[PDB]
Symmetry: C4
Subunit: 237 residues, 4 copies
């Protein structure tokens, strides 16, 4: 009755996260497998795929679920009391499961290229240390969640809830920007479900060893954005 709206929101987050990972990791593998020098969409094209799909998917789901597609976004909004505990945890599970599925589909379609070129997985690139990767993930997620907070509609909520509706364009652009800066360092995580889905499917020791960075970094970044918006700027009111 409003429980149906709740379950439909969970489904919307599951499916959107699946589509997010399918499109973006297919883009990464498609770029990576390219033999002809500069016959691919390039790193710029990869950054567009991540930012542009967030714009599209937040647009589609904002009125249905709130359009999170990302455990760190759900967590930041939870801390600011904009999402209730049970919804938050249900969203994070839906997101993580959807992400596994989307990456699974890319692997099903292009198994050889998928394994050869890194599986869309986040890890620390050679030359950087884990403190740098962690710092880059915290600041990158801070940019994203600070944008999400600035993009919340104070009056309007997702169907049968108090989860605010979000303006999708600035949020997609924040994701695009952070990818431009962070791809050389970690591939860019800023989204624990996206990092976890790829780790589950790719299944390498190196990737699993770095995985904590892509949970801890984004949760800290999200928490600091929440405190900044709500307490330092008092930008809610």
């Amino acid at each position: 009755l409003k429980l149906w709206s709740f379950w439909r929101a969970a489904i919307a987050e599951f499916i959107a996260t699946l589509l997010f990972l399918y499109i973006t990791v297919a883009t990464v593998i498609g770029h990576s497998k390219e033999t002809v020098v500069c016959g691919s969409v390039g790193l710029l094209g990869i950054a567009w795929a991540f930012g542009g799909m967030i714009f599209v998917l937040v647009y589609c789901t904002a009125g249905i679920s709130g359009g999170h597609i990302n455990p760190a976004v759900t967590f930041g909004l939870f801390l600011a009391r904009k999402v209730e505990l049970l919804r938050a945890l249900v969203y994070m599970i839906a997101q993580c499961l959807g992400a596994i599925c989307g990456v699974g589909l890319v692997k099903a379609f292009m198994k050889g290229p998928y394994n050869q070129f890194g599986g869309g997985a986040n890890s620390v690139a050679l030359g950087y240390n884990k403190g740098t990767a962690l710092g880059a993930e915290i600041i990158g997620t801070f940019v994203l969640v600070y944008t999400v907070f600035s993009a919340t509609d104070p009056k309007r909520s997702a169907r049968d809830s108090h989860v605010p509706i979000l303006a999708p364009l600035p949020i997609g652009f924040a994701v695009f920007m952070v990818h431009l800066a962070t791809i050389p360092i970690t591939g860019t995580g800023i989204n624990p479900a996206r990092s976890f889905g790829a780790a589950v499917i790719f299944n390498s020791n190196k990737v699993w060893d770095d995985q904590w960075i892509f949970w801890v970094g984004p949760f800290i970044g999200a928490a600091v954005a929440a405190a900044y918006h709500q307490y330092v700027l008092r930008a809610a009111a």
Copy 2:
């Protein structure tokens, strides 16, 4: 009287699909004929041409025809009872004829490059099987039509009809995103008229042999998006 509005909608879809194919296939041939390494718009530029022209053309025609430019979009909206049978079939014919014309014009302007570089045609790239191409076309069209449904105006319709007006930016971006992911696999069809126009003008056995994928994939993708939006999300109401 409203029959004139009907015929003007058909003309609007014919012309828009012609412009769609002219601009995008001229972009593909112009990229492909380039000798100087990295002197072209690249695959990223091709993906922009397809997404950006959908944004422009849906913007221009949304109030006149509904702005479909694509038999799979018309079919999905038909299944949800948003387009009547006779309009649907008239739109699909207008789209397919316009597409033949637009590709015809590119061939008229650059015949040598046109034949040498593949004629803007969709087919399965070497290394992928038809099951993968079909899967990639279904999911890609699902992203597009799921976006179209989320972009419908519940209150406002095209002139003298009940075909909903569509928000063109998210739709153009969905087309752009799906191109980033799918170009290496099939060139990206997700539009039976676009695939058919190029097949008619280019006229090769290889291309004709793959053509069913670019009709069946998109129609299935569109049907599943329709059912998802209307029955699982109940996102109409």
Copy 3:
């Protein structure tokens, strides 16, 4: 009194066209002079410079002059009786003078590269004939002006006039798209002032010999768009 508004509109078109040519031709020369393979913004970056500056400049001037920046846009709107004769001719002179000035400034800043790399001038590339270039200019300008007509505000006009206000984003995107398709053929003109400014400053026989294409093509494209919108679609009413 409204004559001052008239003269301020002419100044706004002069300055906007100057800025248009300075930014875009500086972009073209900056790309072209690049020695390091793929150390430039590429042809995609050039296409963005033209589309993006039209978006910016139409945004700035739409309420002041109508935001034309382009004799073919002024001519199409003139034919549809949306601009009076004396205003139309004053706008075209302002646009052509501004364009000469903007290209003049690029030459002043980078004289060596400016002359070596073609001076931002439009002409027919080797391999295409003049019939093809003319056809490409007609269709390209048709896309642009068809978009301008679809972007007109039926209720709202520029200050102290009946020149409609225009939605700048779709128009900028139409310019971007047409550049993706047409750069390899003519560089893309679709704007007689832009083509003329560069011809005046660069001053070569080859360029002057092709210059009629960049006036005749766009004026025909604009006229057909006007007739299409107003008479075939009846999209005014």
Copy 4:
């Protein structure tokens, strides 16, 4: 009470300028350190990073501070009496301090690449003289500030102030466009805080010797835009 709103605006400008410099200079260093030919986001990606972050950050801060992120924007608005003297000077200090911090963070994360590849600093490229660089900075800042003035909301102001709210998309696009044209010449400054932050952290004689260009150019460009908008166009009223 409104003094708190004042201090929160200063903090918002400090943090936004820090994020601006971190994301954009990390993008520049990440591009520059790339060994594999065309394995980076390219100069186009760098131009996106600067324009896109201005769009994002102006979006986030427009209702809190006015969204300046740039001493030349604050100065132009000051000259037009849209910002009071004490606020103006407090904003410029906040911006310059934030910029030092953001560049500082990039250096902390990638010290080797940071020093090797120029430190995100603006200076005159080999082949251009200082008159050209100064001219390019004046016109580039004129485009930006002319856009800012055209983007001001006549009715609505930042919290507890008379600083107008700004439309962030056209402003971000103006920054993007000016980067396309100006990167080969100076790297593009058009923002005294951005130029100063990088000079402070990179600390080279060459860079310090050119630094006056990146203060004088933008302040003149801003002043001429202010006079153009307010006195020649009378575009306020």
